[PDB]
UniProtKB/Swiss-Prot annotation, chain B:
Quaternary data: eIF4F is a multi-subunit complex, the composition of which varies with external and internal environmental conditions. It is composed of at least EIF4A, EIF4E and EIF4G1/EIF4G3. EIF4E is also known to interact with other partners. Interacts with EIF4ENIF1/4E-T; promotes recruitment to P-bodies and import into the nucleus. (Microbial infection) Interacts with Lassa virus Z protein.
Gene that produces this protein: EIF4E
Site residues, (Microbial infection) Interaction with potato virus Y VPg: 130
Gene3D superfamilies referenced in this protein's UniProt entry, alphabetically: RNA Cap, Translation Initiation Factor Eif4e (3.30.760.10)
Protein name according to UniProt: Eukaryotic translation initiation factor 4E
Tagged with keyword Transport: yes
């Protein structure tokens, strides 16, 4: 099981921290991706962490603004989300990626175990 | 005659890559260019120096890509493209994996697909516990004529009978829509 939380409505420039509490496998063992889907848009890889060594990579769209991190004591990965914009509006979920030759990054559909996700909405509107 | 001392140049220059899926590490650290070659002689020196696919540890891949095409689906020459999948069970690790991979290497460097050899970007062998795969990568899923010709000739070169069906799967579909559950655009 992967269960994510921390979402909801944020004003542009605001800040959020998502959490994914993971059970079924250790996270020091494998690698964990944040993935997101804006409505109408397709899956987008956000960020990857290998907790065992703490190496991270980010999609270009989020570099400098978002920070992926983990706690093997809690078996949970986080995504600090600073300087949020309207375009960050998406369902954000975690997955274990299955990278292979030719399929390293931007492989958001290439995941076995999958979270349900948490909706993040970035808007300065006053309507639904 | 110069045939005595001249190397025999290949139509294309090729890059041989290796990848070990160490989930603890970064993919750039896990990926290695072994070398590039543009002759028959340089191909055999390289092939004879490396492990057979059947002797690799599970989670290991080889790739051969045309020089200038990155072993990445996002590459300009791959991202509108896809691959013919050959799926091998553990029994075929023993009997087919090595001979099928070498057939694939020589179909690429020998340009065995006639006019449509220009659609070929490279090939990949995956050594996994749950089963091994060989794939030929082509540049464009829409080139139905080139893709099905490459498929037919590959099948003939491998000596697969007509009852045995193989599929071609879009890279974008694989990475972006449906991972393991992605469906065939073509079959042969």
């Amino acid at each position: 099981q992967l269960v994510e939380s921390g979402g909801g409505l944020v004003q542009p420039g605001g800040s959020l921290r998502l959490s994914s509490a993971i059970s079924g496998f250790s996270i020091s063992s494998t690698s964990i991706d944040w993935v997101r889907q804006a409505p109408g848009k397709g899956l987008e890889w956000v960020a990857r962490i290998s907790p065992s060594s703490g190496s991270t990579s980010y999609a270009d769209s989020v570099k400098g603004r978002f920070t992926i991190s983990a706690d093997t004591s809690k078996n949970t990965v986080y995504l600090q989300m600073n300087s949020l914009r309207a375009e960050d509006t998406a369902v954000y979920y975690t997955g274990r990626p299955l990278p292979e030759m030719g399929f390293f990054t931007q492989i958001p559909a290439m995941v076995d175990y999958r979270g349900q996700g948490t909706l993040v909405t970035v808007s300065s509107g006053a309507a639904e | 005659n110069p045939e005595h001392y001249i190397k025999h140049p290949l139509q294309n220059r090729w890059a041989l890559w290796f990848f070990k899926n160490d989930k603890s590490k970064t993919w750039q650290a896990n990926l290695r260019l072994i070398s590039k070659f543009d002759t028959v002689e340089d191909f055999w020196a390289l092939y004879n120096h490396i492990q057979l696919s059947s002797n690799l540890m599970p989670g290991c891949d080889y790739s051969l890509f045309k020089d200038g095409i990155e072993p990445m689906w996002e590459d300009e020459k791959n991202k509108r493209g896809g691959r013919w999948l050959i799926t091998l069970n553990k029994q075929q690790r023993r009997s087919d994996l090595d001979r099928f991979w070498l057939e694939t290497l020589l179909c690429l460097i020998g340009e065995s697909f006639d006019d449509y050899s220009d659609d070929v970007c490279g090939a990949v062998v995956n050594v996994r516990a749950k089963g091994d795969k060989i794939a030929i990568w082509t540049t464009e899923c829409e080139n139905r004529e080139a893709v099905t010709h490459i498929g037919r000739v590959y099948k003939e070169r491998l000596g697969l009978p007509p009852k045995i069906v193989i599929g071609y799967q879009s890279h974008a579909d694989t990475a972006t829509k449906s991972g393991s559950t992605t469906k065939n655009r073509f079959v042969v």
